Amino acid sequence: GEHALRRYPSGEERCIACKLCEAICPALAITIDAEERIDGSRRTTKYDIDMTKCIYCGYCQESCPVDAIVETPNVEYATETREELLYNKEKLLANGDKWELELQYALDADAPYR
Amino acid sequence: AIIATAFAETVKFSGSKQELQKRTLALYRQFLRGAPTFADLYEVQFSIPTIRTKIRQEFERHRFVDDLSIQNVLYAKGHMEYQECINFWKQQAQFLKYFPEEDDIQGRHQPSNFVDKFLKNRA
Amino acid sequence: DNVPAHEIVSGAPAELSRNRVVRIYQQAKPATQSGEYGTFAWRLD
Amino acid sequence: HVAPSAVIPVTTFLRDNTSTQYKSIIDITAVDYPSRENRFEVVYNFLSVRHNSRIRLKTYATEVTPVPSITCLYEGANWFEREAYDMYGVFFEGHPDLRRIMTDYGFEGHPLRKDFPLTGYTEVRWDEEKRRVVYEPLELTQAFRNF
Amino acid sequence: KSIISYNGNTIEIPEEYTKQAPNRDSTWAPAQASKTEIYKNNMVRFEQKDLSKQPMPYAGIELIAQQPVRFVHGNTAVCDGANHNGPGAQGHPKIFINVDAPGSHACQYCGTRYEKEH
Amino acid sequence: MNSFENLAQDVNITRSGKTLIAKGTGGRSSRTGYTATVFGANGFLGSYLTAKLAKHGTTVVVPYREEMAKRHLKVTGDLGVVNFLEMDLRNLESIDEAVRHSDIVVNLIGREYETKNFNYYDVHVEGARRIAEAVKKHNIARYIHVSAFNAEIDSPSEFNHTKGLGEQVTKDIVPWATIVRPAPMFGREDKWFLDRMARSPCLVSANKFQETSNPVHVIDVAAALERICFDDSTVAQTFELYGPQKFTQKQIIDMVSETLRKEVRHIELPKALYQAYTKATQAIWWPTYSPDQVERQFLSQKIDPSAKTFNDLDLTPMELPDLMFKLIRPYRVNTFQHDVSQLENKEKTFVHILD
Amino acid sequence: RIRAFTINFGPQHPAAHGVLRLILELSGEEIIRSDPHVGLLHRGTEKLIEYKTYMQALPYFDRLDYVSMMTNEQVFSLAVEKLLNVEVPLRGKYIRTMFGEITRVLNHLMSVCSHAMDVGALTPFLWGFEEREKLMEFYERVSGARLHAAYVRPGGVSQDLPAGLLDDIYMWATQFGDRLDEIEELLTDNRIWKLRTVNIGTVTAQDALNLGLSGPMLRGSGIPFDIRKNAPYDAYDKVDFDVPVGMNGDCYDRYLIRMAEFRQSLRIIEQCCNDMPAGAVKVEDFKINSPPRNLMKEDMEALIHHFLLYTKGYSVPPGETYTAIEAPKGEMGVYVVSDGSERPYKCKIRAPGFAHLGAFDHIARGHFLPDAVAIIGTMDLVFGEVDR
Amino acid sequence: PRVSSSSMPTDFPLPSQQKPNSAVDYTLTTLDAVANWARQGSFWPVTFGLACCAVEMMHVSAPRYDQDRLGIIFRASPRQSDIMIVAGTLTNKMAPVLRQVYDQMPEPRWVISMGSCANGGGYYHFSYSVVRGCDRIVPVDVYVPGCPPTSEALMYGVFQLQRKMRNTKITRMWYRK
Amino acid sequence: SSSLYRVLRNAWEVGPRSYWKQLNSIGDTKSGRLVGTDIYGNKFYETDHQDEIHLRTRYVEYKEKDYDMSQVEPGWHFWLGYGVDTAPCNTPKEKLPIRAYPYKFQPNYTGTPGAFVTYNTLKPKISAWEPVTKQRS
Numbered sequence A: 001g002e003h004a005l006r007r008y009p010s011g012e013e014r015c016i017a018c019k020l021c022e023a024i025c026p027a028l029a030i031t032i033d034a035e036e037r038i039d040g041s042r043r044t045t046k047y048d049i050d051m052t053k054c055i056y057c058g059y060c061q062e063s064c065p066v067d068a069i070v071e072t073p074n075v076e077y078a079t080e081t082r083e084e085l086l087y088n089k090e091k092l093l094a095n096g097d098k099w100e101l102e103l104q105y106a107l108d109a110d111a112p113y114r
Numbered sequence B: 001a002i003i004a005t006a007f008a009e010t011v012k013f014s015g016s017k018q019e020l021q022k023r024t025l026a027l028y029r030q031f032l033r034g035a036p037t038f039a040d041l042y043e044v045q046f047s048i049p050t051i052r053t054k055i056r057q058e059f060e061r062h063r064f065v066d067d068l069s070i071q072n073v074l075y076a077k078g079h080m081e082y083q084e085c086i087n088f089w090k091q092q093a094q095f096l097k098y099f100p101e102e103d104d105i106q107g108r109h110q111p112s113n114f115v116d117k118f119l120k121n122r123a
Numbered sequence C: 001d002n003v004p005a006h007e008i009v010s011g012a013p014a015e016l017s018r019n020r021v022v023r024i025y026q027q028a029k030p031a032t033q034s035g036e037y038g039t040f041a042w043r044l045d
Numbered sequence D: 001h002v003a004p005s006a007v008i009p010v011t012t013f014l015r016d017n018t019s020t021q022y023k024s025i026i027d028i029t030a031v032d033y034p035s036r037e038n039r040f041e042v043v044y045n046f047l048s049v050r051h052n053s054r055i056r057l058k059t060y061a062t063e064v065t066p067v068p069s070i071t072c073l074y075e076g077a078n079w080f081e082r083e084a085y086d087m088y089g090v091f092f093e094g095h096p097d098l099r100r101i102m103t104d105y106g107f108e109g110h111p112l113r114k115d116f117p118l119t120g121y122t123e124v125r126w127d128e129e130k131r132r133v134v135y136e137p138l139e140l141t142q143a144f145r146n147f
Numbered sequence E: 001k002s003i004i005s006y007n008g009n010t011i012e013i014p015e016e017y018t019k020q021a022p023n024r025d026s027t028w029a030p031a032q033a034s035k036t037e038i039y040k041n042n043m044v045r046f047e048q049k050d051l052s053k054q055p056m057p058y059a060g061i062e063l064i065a066q067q068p069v070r071f072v073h074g075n076t077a078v079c080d081g082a083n084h085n086g087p088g089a090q091g092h093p094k095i096f097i098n099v100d101a102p103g104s105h106a107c108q109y110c111g112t113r114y115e116k117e118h
Numbered sequence F: 001m002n003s004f005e006n007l008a009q010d011v012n013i014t015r016s017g018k019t020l021i022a023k024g025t026g027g028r029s030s031r032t033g034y035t036a037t038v039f040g041a042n043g044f045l046g047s048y049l050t051a052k053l054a055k056h057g058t059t060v061v062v063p064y065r066e067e068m069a070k071r072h073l074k075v076t077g078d079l080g081v082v083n084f085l086e087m088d089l090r091n092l093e094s095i096d097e098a099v100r101h102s103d104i105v106v107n108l109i110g111r112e113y114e115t116k117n118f119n120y121y122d123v124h125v126e127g128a129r130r131i132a133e134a135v136k137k138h139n140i141a142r143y144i145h146v147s148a149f150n151a152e153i154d155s156p157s158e159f160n161h162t163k164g165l166g167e168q169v170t171k172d173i174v175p176w177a178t179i180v181r182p183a184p185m186f187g188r189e190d191k192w193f194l195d196r197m198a199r200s201p202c203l204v205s206a207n208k209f210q211e212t213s214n215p216v217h218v219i220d221v222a223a224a225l226e227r228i229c230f231d232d233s234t235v236a237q238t239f240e241l242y243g244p245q246k247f248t249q250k251q252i253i254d255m256v257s258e259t260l261r262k263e264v265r266h267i268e269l270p271k272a273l274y275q276a277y278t279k280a281t282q283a284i285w286w287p288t289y290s291p292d293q294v295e296r297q298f299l300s301q302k303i304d305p306s307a308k309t310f311n312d313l314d315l316t317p318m319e320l321p322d323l324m325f326k327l328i329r330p331y332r333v334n335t336f337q338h339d340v341s342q343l344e345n346k347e348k349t350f351v352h353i354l355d
Numbered sequence G: 001r002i003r004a005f006t007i008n009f010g011p012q013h014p015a016a017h018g019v020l021r022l023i024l025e026l027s028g029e030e031i032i033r034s035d036p037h038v039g040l041l042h043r044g045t046e047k048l049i050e051y052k053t054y055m056q057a058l059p060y061f062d063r064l065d066y067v068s069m070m071t072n073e074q075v076f077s078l079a080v081e082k083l084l085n086v087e088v089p090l091r092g093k094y095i096r097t098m099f100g101e102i103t104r105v106l107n108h109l110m111s112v113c114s115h116a117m118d119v120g121a122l123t124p125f126l127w128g129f130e131e132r133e134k135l136m137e138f139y140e141r142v143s144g145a146r147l148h149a150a151y152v153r154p155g156g157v158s159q160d161l162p163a164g165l166l167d168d169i170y171m172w173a174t175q176f177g178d179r180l181d182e183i184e185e186l187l188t189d190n191r192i193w194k195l196r197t198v199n200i201g202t203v204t205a206q207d208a209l210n211l212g213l214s215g216p217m218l219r220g221s222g223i224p225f226d227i228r229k230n231a232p233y234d235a236y237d238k239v240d241f242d243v244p245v246g247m248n249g250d251c252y253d254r255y256l257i258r259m260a261e262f263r264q265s266l267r268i269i270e271q272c273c274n275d276m277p278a279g280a281v282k283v284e285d286f287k288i289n290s291p292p293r294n295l296m297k298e299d300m301e302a303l304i305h306h307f308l309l310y311t312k313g314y315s316v317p318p319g320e321t322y323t324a325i326e327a328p329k330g331e332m333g334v335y336v337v338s339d340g341s342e343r344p345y346k347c348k349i350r351a352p353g354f355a356h357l358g359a360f361d362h363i364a365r366g367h368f369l370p371d372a373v374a375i376i377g378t379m380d381l382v383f384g385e386v387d388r
Numbered sequence H: 001p002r003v004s005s006s007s008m009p010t011d012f013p014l015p016s017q018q019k020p021n022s023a024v025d026y027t028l029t030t031l032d033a034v035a036n037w038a039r040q041g042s043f044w045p046v047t048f049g050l051a052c053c054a055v056e057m058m059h060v061s062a063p064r065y066d067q068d069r070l071g072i073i074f075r076a077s078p079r080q081s082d083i084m085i086v087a088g089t090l091t092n093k094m095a096p097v098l099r100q101v102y103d104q105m106p107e108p109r110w111v112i113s114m115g116s117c118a119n120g121g122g123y124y125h126f127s128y129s130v131v132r133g134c135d136r137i138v139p140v141d142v143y144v145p146g147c148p149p150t151s152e153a154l155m156y157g158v159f160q161l162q163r164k165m166r167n168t169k170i171t172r173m174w175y176r177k
Numbered sequence I: 001s002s003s004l005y006r007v008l009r010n011a012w013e014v015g016p017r018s019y020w021k022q023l024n025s026i027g028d029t030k031s032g033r034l035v036g037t038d039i040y041g042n043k044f045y046e047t048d049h050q051d052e053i054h055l056r057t058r059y060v061e062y063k064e065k066d067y068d069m070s071q072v073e074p075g076w077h078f079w080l081g082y083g084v085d086t087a088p089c090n091t092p093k094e095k096l097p098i099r100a101y102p103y104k105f106q107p108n109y110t111g112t113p114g115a116f117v118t119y120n121t122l123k124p125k126i127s128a129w130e131p132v133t134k135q136r137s
């Protein structure tokens, strides 16, 4: 379902701008830009998903080596405007902060099989 | 069997320019005869003379071609378009692709010299 | 001359025939890698 | 592996000969090899439910040189040959009604050619001035990334 | 805060919403746009909208700096951000961090820092 | 490729100091750099104007009252080009929000009838004054205000009186304002001209069908406004957009019934009766022919010669008889075919009942 | 002279399950010429696939015939496996077979009970769609999607079965037979159904072959051909099922064939739920398939292979293959060409509906318009596959 | 006495923040409530299923999720319809038909965009035959995301449009005008 | 079960207040035990009766009259849906996610001023020259 960017229990964000989700995405829905953070870390400055391009296949969730991009079980996020479906980094991180418990249930059930 | 549609023509590549001449002239005749039908079927906002002018323009576009096989392909595609227009398969939207001149003037600044195109970054 | 003008039947725009330029080239052997499989093909761009 | 002149004889052999009873047409396709002088390779796939065997037959074509139609033998070839024309531009001589089947009614171009771009040359919108669906040149908000 | 627009006018935004995150005022990367630059360039789409309800997540650059340094007896520290409370991997690839040098040293996946017991 | 037919250049600097660099060839995904605010965008002329502005990526701000009347404008442009704000002239914060970020402001606000909450003054003069004071407070580069033809401060009609007073307060508050004076606009889904001539059960005139005007096509008026928007030559000027040929209402009705192939009904009953009937029909809730309109039935167009015209914009209008076919053919019945004699013996060769 | 009258059956209308412009010409009630206009769902799938890796290209096949997803991805996986020269493990084969027959049940529940609805029987649609929901839950439990699973991939299966799925599939199978029986009570021996189906849409065996028809359309004319028995692919050589074949080439025979196929799919599902082996569900060659995550996060070779498979993809040997399956619609095939690269050079999908809708002109001539609806319904035409 | 002044108010509330405080306000509120309740409880879309999102529409008509319980009946002709659910990719050969169907619909009319293919072109965004959203052809009131959007997701979209029409001002806006 | 004894028996179990609330909200009469409550105020129930069918055993009683499934806190959105057998009320402490930030639950704000406004997190790639002038000395 709806996409989300996850964090560690530290609070640090898991994504490291490897761009494998951007590369495997059949619909070219992901757009990423990155650089060296002030503390020397490889982290994204841009992470956008066009939901109106996405096919909800899960290839990004399979490709991620850090369990950063995931798909929640949510489907109840319909909108009145299409400019609300051009999700950005802040939206996705807030969505992860919102859905972390459901994602943890799903991961504890699903990770051995993937 | 699978039978052909109303105004279908079996694909037959002429081995002569003199036969394809007659075929092309017949197709021109058919387009001209069908222009009133093209104006009635598609709710056209302009003259039947304008439709015939456009037909003549598109037939003049390929007037000085001399390779026979290219002319055969052009005749076949012209007959395809005739069958698509006379049988109401196209809609007005696709028929009026041929007629961009009849739509109102596209703005004020249409460059035709260098400095215009430069100021608009088209040189 | 006497090369056929397939442009007339391509259906493509004429701006390709009148305004645009292509380049025909072999991909340069990269400095980042010692491989050479991307070469040997003549790219058109 | 045969030539265009050899399509109808060989297919008659593959349809009527007792040891080679390929009676079902499966598919007719074309493939663009723009490095070849005859760029298009017209492929035929046939099945024999008698002997439970499949065979393939390949010929060649150009943008202007046609191929013989096998609709005289296999009526099922009609739509397939039409699709090959619509996608690649291969003209099948002898075909009763050869016209576009997949593409838009005024589509200019043959998409599966390698020189045809993925996104094509035109797009459509609704013009409120003209109150019409208008075909205009292409502009993408996000350009295609090949990778 | 009042932000001067490109047409010369003012864009009044409260201070709470000019922060890049609720736990950090400034940016943490060069190419990152400031909230003032965002509003100054997109205020037509922010105008009648509620800034209370937009996404404003916490920044990890400030949360990982709160996490204390770990200490090891040796030249190597091994990091695998595993959960230890649910099945499966659930972490990042196993990484070995050299720590012989004087300071602290961070993992490349998470920012957990390690030192050589001094 | 597409083209920016509206712009002469791609680097454009406003009169307020903003640098606008056009991005792209001129299509949907292109952007001029300009931001605009069209205050009557829901309506007849405003829809065409917003379409023409957003075709090339001009960020249109559309202030709206009814959520449902505006929806057709979002189709005119790409994502982020057409932006909606809820507005009422009795709310100044609304108008400031609408005009804050704009380089071009266009007031197309006007009613041909008086309502419970808005008389002719409250809409044409006070609303114009409120918008103009917003435009002056925010130093907007270009303000383009539409005042109806035959506008005159003291006049028989209160519509023209109030429109002239608006055209004065705009010019006094915003001296760099442009005033565009359109003549009766015709077109598709027009307000009171052609659709009305072709659908009405009976037309009426207190005068004879004798008021004379030069009518103009709405799309050409929208084009002229488009050209005025980006032409900084047009500050502090007045425009009289009136069209090529002169006509009376009787001439136009004759044209309509020759196109339509149906006899348009007209009555020609006196003034004191029709004016009272109109005054009575303002008690229903839906729009009807107003008494001031039958007052304007005696006021023919007086063109101001000092005002600019179409030709200053390098525009050549259409005129009504060449477009009446296009506009009225939906109401053409097309009763039957012509002279079915000479059909008998050819019809004799076909099968009409299958056995 | 018999002047003909042209009616457009409708670009948007109920009988087409999708989008079809059937330009029929009538002389009274009788159809004399038909002209199915298609391309209204042509999305350029076969050109897009040329710009995609073999993994990126697989979800094109879930969206061709969108009632039978897993079989489309099955045939693409079989083609790419034949080019790659890799062997799927036994458990993956059994999973693919079980789910291919679940997919066949889904396709026939759509097709028979939409044919019924278009002919006028409204109630079987709504009965069968609950069974469709019950099977969609198994799709969702194995793949995470109700319809577009992207589960069967080149090399086997994405994820192993979750725990407790075979028990639930058996629980569904203990009761699906009575659902079939209740549908048959309404339809099979009914007078009106037989009137709308008996000796309508008749096609001879010879013409069925000449037109390129397969599946129930070819088996209703009398030819015993089924690719699962004549050229078995995944595990159909390790499971017992019978093939229904009919005489008289009519729509009633096709309906009976599809109900027999329901019951045989149930048989196969029972056998697969009883004989599901152990082991891996994808090839154990990490140059073709992703490794597990706990190795990708501990082993260097595993992570390298993950990176390359998810960025560049696996390179397929040069060559070409036409392979086919007995899709529930008929013989579905994929003609792939490989240029030694990670992306295909050419992928043509032989959709079974293309040939059938092409044969509509031959089959529907001489019929009345109410019978054209039955013919479109027995062809079982989804238009993603027709138009691709 | 020709009017030369105006006591026209400032600080007048906008529609989406206007509370009723007079008898006429509550009367018009009740009339709008009745009209909107009828528009909700009779919610008749037009049968415009083009692709695999129609499968989810049909499942929303199936026993588990029964659209008819909420008043929903899918109507073949647009003249009898109030909603258009664009459920499937929009091809350049099909867009004129979509706009004709939309224009044949009597006002009030709304449009739901169902699926990624109809929202922004989707999976086939970069094709030569697909429209990059029904936004380009018709105006859209609610966008339902997914590929396919589950039956629950389309029901959530129907509820969002129900909320939109439930907060729609019909007579109150006239009383403002 | 679609029988009258069901609604009568449940409306005897849950009093008339709950009956009228359920009739105004769900349209059906359901009796179950309270499992827990979410941060928004929605109460979640579970039934044990044989009458209730598969997937009708767990249900919600919203707090807002303008209810919306987006108002259901995560965890319960999964429990309501038959994903986990244990509610987030009765989950162990170790299965819960660790958060270094405060949890803020915000439902869908579409159709409101709180709708998400998308933007570019980056600045322009090409930085322009801020003009400064020098004199010819």
Ligand SMILES: CCCCCCCCCCCCCCCCCC(=O)OC[C@H](COP(=O)(O)OCCN)OC(=O)CCCCCCCCCCCCCCCCC
Binding pocket: F066, F068, F069, F191, F192, F196, F285, F286, F287, F288, H031, H169, H170, H171, H173, H174
């Ligand atoms: C027991 C039973 C009890 C029954 C109780 C019923 C009580 C009713 C009390 C009604 C009092 C309040 C009336 C307010 C209704 C107005 C609603 C509204 O605000 O606008 C919506 C609709 C819009 O129509 P429109 O102005 O064209 O806007 C287009 C874009 N929405 O507005 C409308 O719907 C207006 C409908 C008008 C219908 C008249 C149609 C014309 C018929 C006569 C011919 C005149 C045509 C003139 C058209 C203009 C031509 C230039």
Ligand SMILES: NC(=O)C1=CN([C@@H]2O[C@H](COP(=O)(O)OP(=O)(O)OC[C@H]3O[C@@H](n4cnc5c(N)ncnc54)[C@H](OP(=O)(O)O)[C@@H]3O)[C@@H](O)[C@H]2O)C=CC1
Binding pocket: F039, F040, F041, F042, F043, F044, F045, F046, F064, F065, F066, F069, F088, F089, F107, F108, F109, F110, F111, F112, F118, F123, F146, F147, F148, F149, F182, F183, F184, F185, F186, F191
């Ligand atoms: N049409 C013609 O023949 C002529 C028109 N004009 C003038 O040119 C302009 C064109 O308008 P027209 O093309 O006629 O189509 P409209 O007159 O229908 O455009 C009317 C616009 O004014 C808005 N409006 C009216 N009253 C108010 C108000 N009190 N508060 C806020 N907004 C209001 C309407 O909003 P809503 O839609 O919400 O009511 C609508 O957007 C007007 O200024 C008109 O006076 C001059 C000469 C001839």
Ligand code: SF4
Binding pocket: A021, A024, A025, A026, A027, A028, A029, A030, A049, A053, A054, A055, A056, A057, A058, A059, A060, A061
């Ligand atoms: S799951 Fe969605 S975002 Fe991820 S690759 Fe697939 S389509 Fe793109």
Ligand code: SF4
Binding pocket: A014, A015, A016, A017, A018, A019, A020, A021, A022, A032, A060, A063, A064, A065, A066, A067, A068, A069
């Ligand atoms: S989300 Fe995962 S796969 Fe995508 S860039 Fe970040 S770490 Fe890499």
Ligand code: SF4
Binding pocket: A055, G063, H051, H052, H053, H087, H088, H089, H114, H115, H116, H117, H118, H122, H123, H146, H147, H148, H149
């Ligand atoms: S959005 Fe997805 S499910 Fe819907 S039509 Fe497009 S590909 Fe099919």
Ligand SMILES: [Zn+2]
Binding pocket: E079, E080, E081, E092, E095, E107, E108, E109, E110, E111, E112
């Ligand atoms: Zn680490």
